[PDB]
Amino acid sequence: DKWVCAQPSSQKATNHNLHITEKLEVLAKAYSVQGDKWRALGYAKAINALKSFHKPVTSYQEACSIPGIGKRMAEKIIEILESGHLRKLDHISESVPVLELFSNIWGAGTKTAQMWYQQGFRSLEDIRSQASLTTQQAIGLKHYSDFLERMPREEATEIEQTVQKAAQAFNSGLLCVACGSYRRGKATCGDVDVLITHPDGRSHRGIFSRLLDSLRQEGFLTDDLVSQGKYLGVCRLPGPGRRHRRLDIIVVPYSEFACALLYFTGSAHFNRSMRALAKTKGMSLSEHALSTAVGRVLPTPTEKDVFRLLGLPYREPAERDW
DNA sequence: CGGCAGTACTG
DNA sequence: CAGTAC
DNA sequence: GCCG
Numbered sequence: 001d002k003w004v005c006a007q008p009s010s011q012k013a014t015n016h017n018l019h020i021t022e023k024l025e026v027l028a029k030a031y032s033v034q035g036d037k038w039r040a041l042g043y044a045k046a047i048n049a050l051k052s053f054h055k056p057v058t059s060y061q062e063a064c065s066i067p068g069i070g071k072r073m074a075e076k077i078i079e080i081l082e083s084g085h086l087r088k089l090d091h092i093s094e095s096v097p098v099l100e101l102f103s104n105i106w107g108a109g110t111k112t113a114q115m116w117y118q119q120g121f122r123s124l125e126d127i128r129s130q131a132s133l134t135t136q137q138a139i140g141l142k143h144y145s146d147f148l149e150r151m152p153r154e155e156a157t158e159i160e161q162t163v164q165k166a167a168q169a170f171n172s173g174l175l176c177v178a179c180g181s182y183r184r185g186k187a188t189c190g191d192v193d194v195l196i197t198h199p200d201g202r203s204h205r206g207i208f209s210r211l212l213d214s215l216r217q218e219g220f221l222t223d224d225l226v227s228q229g230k231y232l233g234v235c236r237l238p239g240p241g242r243r244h245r246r247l248d249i250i251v252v253p254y255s256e257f258a259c260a261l262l263y264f265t266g267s268a269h270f271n272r273s274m275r276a277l278a279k280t281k282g283m284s285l286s287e288h289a290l291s292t293a294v295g296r297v298l299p300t301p302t303e304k305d306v307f308r309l310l311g312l313p314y315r316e317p318a319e320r321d322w
Numbered sequence: 323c324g325g326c327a328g329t330a331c332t333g
Numbered sequence: 334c335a336g337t338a339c
Numbered sequence: 340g341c342c343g
């Protein structure tokens with residue numbers, strides 16, 4: 001009950017504290033872009049706890065009883081109830097909107113955004129004309145609007161099928177699965193996360209590099225962000241009315257398929273919760289394996305096996321959307 | 323008092 | 334390594 | 340920010 005990975009994410013669909021969480025999310029984002037990662041994490045978990053709670057919180061004692069809600073978070077909750085506003089919202093640093101603008105460049109995080117801000121930059125025009133940009137950041141800036149748009153899941157299907165058909169031309173036995181938000185059933189997707197493997201345990205070897213050359217040669221790939229080991233990049237379906245879309249690809253041996261599928265399906269906060277739980281049980285969970293701590297690799301032929309070994313009820317991908 | 327997921331790319 | 338991202 |  002203290003573990004989100006032990007609960008269905010559909011509990012959030014009936015948020016009875018939206019007036020609270022809408023204001024806390026503003027603070028959470030402010031701490032995040034300013035680099036206060038751990039304070040922001042605490043806010044993120046408190047927001048999920050509030051979103052999934054069964055009733056509107058009405059008392060300081062009720063709030064404190066909720067896991068992920070402590071004294072400080074309770075005090076903020078009582079303020080929004082009594083007064084309808086949260087004073088701290090009127091005292092967020094004026095740098096935050098600009099820091100958010102900059103850190104939405106792919107490849108630029110809090111450290112780069114703060115440095116640019118200290119150098120006097122305030123707009124993407126300033127970044128374009130005056131900032132020093134890595135190769136990655138230049139692609140991010142070129143695709144600034146593209147990378148902030150989410151595509152309809154129907155388009156993600158088309159992208160998945162494009163990768164799959166190019167892969168299976170090399171070996172008809174290859175398996176390709178779109179993971180991430182697509183597999184969790186969301187109506188829109190920030191990118192497409194394609195997992196590739198081969199049931200024979202070995203014929204996945206070598207195809208990653210040939211697959212990319214195939215997709216480049218047919219013009220499907222339009223920019224590469226990372227292209228050693230795994231692929232993070234940019235694609236565009238052919239024809240009119242098409243946008244550049246983010247595409248990630250990972251190729252894994254079949255022996256790791258369940259753990260890779262689990263990792264790549266997420267959500268990110270679901271994974272972090274499941275991994276933290278594994279740690280408390282003397283185990284370690286990664287996209288490669290569930291193992292004992294420093295270790296023995298535990299047998300996980302299917303996703304269900306990972307849940308069972310952690311003592312968790314199985315959750316379909318749609319219920320992992322934390 | 324100290325962790326807060328685990329891994330992997332770039333330069 | 335620090336910074337960034339999945 | 341929260342929690343053990």
Ligand SMILES: O=c1ccn([C@H]2C[C@H](O)[C@@H](COP(=O)(O)NP(=O)(O)OP(=O)(O)O)O2)c(=O)[nH]1
Pocket residue numbers: 179180181182188189190191192193263264265266267268271272339
């Ligand atoms: O910090 C992270 C980020 C992602 N992941 C895993 C889970 C996530 O679902 C998967 C793909 O990452 P994306 O950034 O593509 N996120 P997702 O597909 O969930 O949402 P969207 O792409 O629609 O924003 O990688 C993590 O484990 N930790």
Ligand SMILES: [Cl-]
Pocket residue numbers: 012051
């Ligand atoms: Cl939500």
Ligand SMILES: [Cl-]
Pocket residue numbers: 317
């Ligand atoms: Cl499925």
Ligand SMILES: [Cl-]
Pocket residue numbers: 205206207208209210
């Ligand atoms: Cl290869």
Ligand SMILES: [Cl-]
Pocket residue numbers: 292
């Ligand atoms: Cl043991």
Ligand SMILES: [Mg+2]
Pocket residue numbers: 179180181182189190191192193
């Ligand atoms: Mg995704």
Ligand SMILES: [Mg+2]
Pocket residue numbers: 180191192193248339
């Ligand atoms: Mg992705």
Ligand code: NA
Pocket residue numbers: 102103104105106107108109
């Ligand atoms: Na960024």
